[PDB]
């Protein structure tokens, strides 16, 4: 389908240790491909999937410089946050930053992102038009006016429609067989009595990529809503994902029920029955 590239960075202050940690991770769709950790020894951007290692020595040099610049600036931003909120350095605080772009199946630019959260709450975000900001509070409004005067939006728009998209297209070509793949789910069902009159049917999907998947239960052709339990999609650890969906059914009636499995890698949906 369409594809995304995202970098996610987390800065955390550590009173007592004394010195903050910055860690950034890079993804294409659901595949992580790089990391940088300010606490680590290398002080380098590092590969986290083999496909990115098609890149030359200059890639690692340049990417390291850029992520180190980010690390310095967001660690400075923690201190600025303290000023704007009138907070003490005695406390630990968190600054999260996400940026990146989406392209279509043919590489066309779709969307760009540049956004921050402080202590788990939205701080500031670049709007879809890539020309203005949404500030979540008074502190963020200070940043917003500053970034407006400095034309930070035009700068980001240029990156997002340029370098960001160019990089993503490049990765999709170089790592084509990894990133443009669909691994369909392997499925099975389990059954667990709850009482003498109710039992749980659980529909399992394993080994799939990308992470998006729809598991649905229906009784005689319609939804179940809050009779169905859907667990958070989870990594298997090997580059594939897992999920399950459960329904509580009347004992002896394990047949008014169907599990339909729908995934991008399935030519036709699966139908499972106990």
């Amino acid at each position: 389908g369409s594809h995304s590239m995202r970098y996610f960075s987390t800065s955390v202050s550590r009173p007592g240790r004394g010195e903050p940690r910055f860690i950034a991770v890079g993804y294409v769709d659901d595949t992580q491909f790089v990391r940088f950790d300010s606490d680590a020894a290398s002080q380098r951007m590092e590969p986290r999937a083999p496909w990115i290692e098609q890149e030359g020595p200059e890639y690692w040099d340049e990417e390291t410089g850029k992520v180190k610049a980010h690390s310095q600036t967001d660690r400075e931003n923690l201190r600025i946050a303290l000023r704007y909120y009138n907070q003490s350095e005695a406390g630990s605080h968190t600054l999260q930053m996400m940026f990146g772009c989406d392209v279509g199946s043919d590489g066309r630019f779709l969307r760009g992102y540049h956004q921050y959260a402080y202590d788990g709450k939205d701080y500031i975000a670049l709007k879809e038009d890539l020309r203005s900001w949404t500030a979540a509070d008074m502190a963020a409004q200070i940043t917003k006016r500053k970034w407006e005067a400095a034309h930070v939006a035009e700068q980001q728009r240029a990156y997002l429609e340029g370098t960001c998209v160019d990089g993503l297209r490049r990765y999709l070509e170089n790592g084509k067989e990894t990133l443009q793949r669909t691994d369909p789910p392997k499925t099975h069902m389990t059954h667990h009595p709850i009482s003498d009159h109710e039992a749980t049917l659980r529909c399992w999907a394993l080994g799939f990529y990308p992470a998006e998947i729809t598991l649905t239960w229906q009784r005689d052709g319609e939804d179940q809503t809050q009779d169905t339990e859907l667990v958070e999609t989870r990594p298997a650890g090997d580059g594939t994902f897992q999920k399950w969906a459960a329904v509580v059914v009347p004992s002896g009636e394990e047949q008014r029920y169907t599990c339909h499995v729908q995934h991008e890698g399935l030519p036709k949906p699966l139908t499972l029955r106990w």
Partner: peptide
């Protein structure tokens, strides 16, 4: 390919 950020 990495981008860049600004001070708050």
């Amino acid at each position: 390919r990495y981008g860049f950020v600004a001070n708050f």
